Amino acid sequence: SQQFDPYPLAMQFISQYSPEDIVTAQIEGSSGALWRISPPSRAQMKQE
């Protein structure tokens, strides 16, 4: 709330939400699976 205080629309929108309604998703930075790709398609990607 304090971050968006100088903006009224943000305060209204946040005010329309109860504390136990807004959640943060902590997504891991690294991928969760190997980047499978055919070498011809990788070469085509690099050429593109």
Partner 1 sequence: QLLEGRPDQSVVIPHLFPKYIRAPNGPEANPVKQLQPDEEEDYLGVRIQLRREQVTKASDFLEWWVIELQDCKADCNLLPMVIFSD
Q: Which residues bind partner 1 (CB under 8 A)?
A: 4, 7, 9-10, 12-14, 17, 21-31, 33-35, 38-40, 42, 45-46
Using alpha carbons, select from 47, 1, 48 the residue that is nearest to residue 22: 1
Within 10 angstroms of residue 14's Cβ, the number of other Cβ atoms is 13
Kindly state the smallest distance separating residue 2's Cβ from partner 1, in Å.
Answer: 14
Kindly state the smallest distance separating residue 24's Cβ from partner 1, in Å.
Answer: 5
Contact 11, 1 (CB under 8 A): yes
Closest to partner 1 by CB, 2 vs 26, is 26
